Amino acid sequence: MKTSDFVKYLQRMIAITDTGLTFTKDPFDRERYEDLRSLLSEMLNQASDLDSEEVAEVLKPTSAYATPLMDVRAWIVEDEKICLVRGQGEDSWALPGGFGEVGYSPTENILKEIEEETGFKAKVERLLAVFDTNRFQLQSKQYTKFVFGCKLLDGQFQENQEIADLQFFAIDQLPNLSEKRITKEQIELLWQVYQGHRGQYLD
Amino acid sequence: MKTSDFVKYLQRMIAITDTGLTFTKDPFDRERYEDLRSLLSEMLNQASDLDSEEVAEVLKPTSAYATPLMDVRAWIVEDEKICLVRGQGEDSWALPGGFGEVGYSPTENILKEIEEETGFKAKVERLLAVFDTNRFQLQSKQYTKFVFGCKLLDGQFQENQEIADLQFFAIDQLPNLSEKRITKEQIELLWQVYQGHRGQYLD
């Protein structure tokens, strides 16, 4: 593909993205258009010919099948209490995290989720568990739920469009849990792994 | 622009656009994402030598939720040699495994694939690594590649419709690898984790 054809596609996509940035009324759509606009701008700066044979060989294999969905969670313990967050408009609590996003590794995914939800930079210590939601919180979609032990670094919690509150809870004083995201049984297993009283948990 | 960066940009923009289609509640935002997906499809056609079937395979929506996909692999060592399999119609070798199927847990998935491919029942001993395919073997889809250390139990290898051959190889006498499934660098890393020279590998 020639540079001029690449520029054509990029400019057409930028037009649509800019329209989204002007007209959308939804903050989560706005975030997506901001992400797209940033990527497209970088791409335009880098516009060049592309080796279409090389592109095809990097893309292969092209066939893909549905798998369980990636979910990432952070296990953060301070003063023997666990960090839980409560979503906007929700009355239940869960470990920070959410869907794994394409374009980020497993550890980068949890760090991205921690920063966006909690307002803190963080470090990943270890993977504590890989849970199957079919075992612990059966739902219409199946997830592979990675739970990483993490430490918070610099930052500050700020209520935002995703998260209404962030608090630390003793395991014998847990609040109402969002079961589809984390259960008391999972928290108890995680505490055992965290304290080195059993090995990494795998479903 | 580098080929690898083009593929990562495309992969990411497909994921964002698909997330917009699933989550937006406004018909004009829906149309914007649809128009973006049409442009991504046109750009991919022009940027790559993929045939029409292959292009459709890349663009076929795999899921309503765009996340990295599951791939599972088995690390089986006997007499200090590593089990590799060669698929029917293929000249190269990989660790047993494949994509994670919905309806099975991560360990159940690897045990199922070990039995189907190698003819053996097995035990999962530990998780050795979770690799990001975007790092080690970039391809159209991003996978979280779980590599489980496993021990074979009862059974027998028989050539079947999926697998042409199964052999054990010394760490320093590896055959030609199916790199989109496993690389020499990954095998070397895995050997170090397996031998306890370093901890679990996580991207």
Residue numbers in the entry:
A (entry chain B), B (entry chain A): 1 to 203
What text appears in the publication on this structure?
The gene is located in an operon containing MurF, suggesting that it plays a role in the Mur pathway of peptidoglycan biosynthesis by hydrolyzing Mur pathway substrates.
The 1.39 Å resolution structure of this enzyme shows that it is an asymmetric homodimer with two distinct catalytic sites, one “open” and one “closed-in”. The C-terminal catalytic domain contains the Nudix signature sequence that encodes residues involved in Mg2+ binding and catalysis. The two C-terminal catalytic domains form a symmetric dimer stabilized by an extensive network of salt bridges and hydrogen bonds formed by Gln200, Leu127, Asp203, Thr107, Phe146, Gly103, Tyr104, Asp132, and Gln142. The two HLH motifs stack against each other to form a four-helix bundle. The approximate two-fold axis of symmetry relating the N-terminal HLH motifs does not coincide with the two-fold axis of the C-terminal catalytic domain dimer, making UDP-Xase an asymmetric homodimer. The “closed-in” site can accommodate a Nudix substrate but is too small to engage RNA.
